[PDB]
């Protein structure tokens, strides 16, 4: 519950804040090293914190991050710390020059990839102040021959797809393996929407298909990770062994017309058994009665 | 002449009335009401002895009951006996044409508790007059067409003489007492008849032959009993039984009743016509617990 001062969003003790200043790499290294420290990526949730902030990420812009390298050959080490665990670079521009004493690195793109610019211009940056994901868990089973008998995985955004992708890549080490996603249709018409166990009517926002995946007017799609990693594979779901990850007043009447309806409620002590509005349709519907009708 | 069993009378598409015959029933001549867009029969039009396989003889002599019996016995004749509504109406109209109250032939055995005709035929007709009139053990046909209970050891201006319980895995009971409780009559009956013996629920209809059985059992002590009660009351904002069980055999007359009151009158007809009557006064409870089916 660590709360910071007017803008620094916290996550597990520390908090971040983006500065609205456009300056070079040396001035940024001199400003937040303000009594602050530059940003360092160590987990998966902070990537979400960086992507959801930054004013729609300012798609056509770049963000700084402090990475230094003085000795040759190339050897990246953080300015404050040595916990090198996560590297998220663009595919695939390493931008590693021949030889240069000052090194720099920048968030590019909406996904938040890492690139190596010349850091001779002025740009914005972020600095700090002093399985599971952070809000929900993700469990996987040993074998799943049937199709979704215990869980039905549902996805909403692209970052959740990236998170499940890196989770399954940390789990998977070989090819020839399939997964399950919430995308199927039982009407055999062709419309594809976010599948569920009944009662799903949301509109599809994002989709990652291959060059030519869909060749069947139905079925339940899959997810492979051999070469086409992170994309939706299509295949029939009649009997297909594939695992899946699960996110873890005449007489005796009382009423009032202030709601334009005659009510009938009971207490919690004078009654025989605790009564609610659930099964009232078995008893009150004989008089044309329904739920609490307030305008 | 609206007998309160087939018509709903309370605080209130044309309505037209007719007379219904029920194939020699003890309540012949009932008035029903329906839509008169259909076709029916017309029999009578009003402007300004042998009868129905029976024979009748009237004597205008003034004499007692046994004297009239001896007077009719010489010609092989027996005193009158009312067991059908048609012959009852004929006897009444003949008495009115004679303009007098004539003798009726019958006798009891034990202090006017078990009345019986002189033919030996099971009782199937009752047209008594009043309850607080049983002073003696004889009856006389009056002008209004009822049976005034008096002693016929008198001198009438004439006489007439004619010539021609365990059942289906359930046990019932009849209570003849006096009660005055006229409040909270929807949550006491179960605890009332449960104290008598365990496993005793209110009468529920789950078969089809119990109605005829209780109908044949009803006309045994119907001297002052004419209505039949039911166990259908206001339960769970609906018209159901007292126990926590749904209803299967519908007992509605027509349309769809929407009685929202805490109680009403579910009655059984003479033939089995399902009848519901909404009440505004509680002065129909005579007839609810004293001499009725509980």
UniProtKB/Swiss-Prot annotation, chain B:
Domain of life according to the entry: Eukaryota
State which residues carry a glycan (glycosylated). 32, 236
Give expression by tissue.
Answer: Expressed in spleen, thymus, colon and peripheral blood lymphocytes. Detected in myeloid and B-lymphoid cell lines. Isoform 2 and isoform 3 are expressed in malignant Hodgkin lymphoma cells called Hodgkin and Reed-Sternberg (HRS) cells.
Q: How is it modified after translation?
A: N-glycosylated.
Subcellular compartments: Membrane
For the C-type lectin domain, which residue ranges apply?
A: 51-163, 167-290
- Disulphide bridges, residue numbers: 16-36, 138-152
Report further notes: Isoform 2 and isoform 3 are produced in HRS cells by a transcriptional control mechanism which cotranscribe an mRNA containing LY75 and CD302 prior to generating the intergenically spliced mRNA to produce LY75/CD302 fusion proteins.
| Chain's role | Acts as an endocytic receptor to direct captured antigens from the extracellular space to a specialized antigen-processing compartment. Causes reduced proliferation of B-lymphocytes.
Protein name listed in UniProt: Lymphocyte antigen 75
The shown range, given as first to last of full length, is 1035 to 1378 of 1722
